[PDB]
């Protein structure tokens, strides 16, 4: 499962954060800072895969804001990238032309979508339309 998934901007600002492992607040902040420094101190030809703390630290940002994942060394590396791409596509479909400004304003919506998509670091909605329909139904409830 994904130990922690956090969306951090190029400048270092974090637009999202979702850790599935209970860690101390100071320890979590230190881990996030180290991950940001590693991603911010890594080139574009590093394969987007880093083995930091025995965790598959996969960094793959399609825009100025980057995304990071932390999964155990028990599954294929391409699976994490595919899951990240699927989540990005689902978020773009739910919002519509998702940008950095919209992510900050839609932090609650992004957190709800992430919770409804992956729970506990594992994939919960394999399909892309079912999750979107469920999110829309939950939003329409009020």
């Amino acid at each position: 499962m994904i130990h922690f998934i956090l969306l951090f901007s190029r400048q270092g600002k974090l637009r999202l954060q979702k850790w599935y492992i209970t860690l101390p607040d100071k320890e979590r902040k230190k881990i996030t800072r180290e991950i940001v420094q590693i991603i911010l101190s890594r080139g574009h030809r590093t394969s987007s895969f880093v083995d930091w703390k025995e965790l598959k630290l996969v960094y793959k940002r399609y825009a100025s804001l980057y995304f990071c994942c932390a999964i155990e060394n028990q599954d294929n590396e391409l699976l994490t990238l595919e899951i990240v791409h699927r989540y990005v596509e689902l978020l773009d479909k739910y919002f519509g032309n998702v940008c950095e400004l919209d992510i900050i304003f839609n932090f609650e919506k992004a957190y709800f979508i992430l919770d409804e998509f992956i729970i506990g670091g594992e994939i919960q909605e394999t399909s892309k339309k079912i999750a979107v329909k469920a999110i829309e139904d939950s939003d329409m409830l009020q």
């Binding site: 599954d75 294929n76 699976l79 595919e82 899951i83 791409h85 699927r86 596509e89 994939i123 394999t126 399909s127 892309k128 339309k129 079912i130």
Partner: peptide, 20 residues
């Protein structure tokens, strides 16, 4: 498949789980 078919692979998560 309209659902779970991404990049020409239908149910990639299901296929990965089956392989695992």
């Amino acid at each position: 498949s309209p659902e779970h078919d991404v990049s020409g692979i239908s149910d990639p998560f299901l296929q990965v789980r089956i392989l695992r």
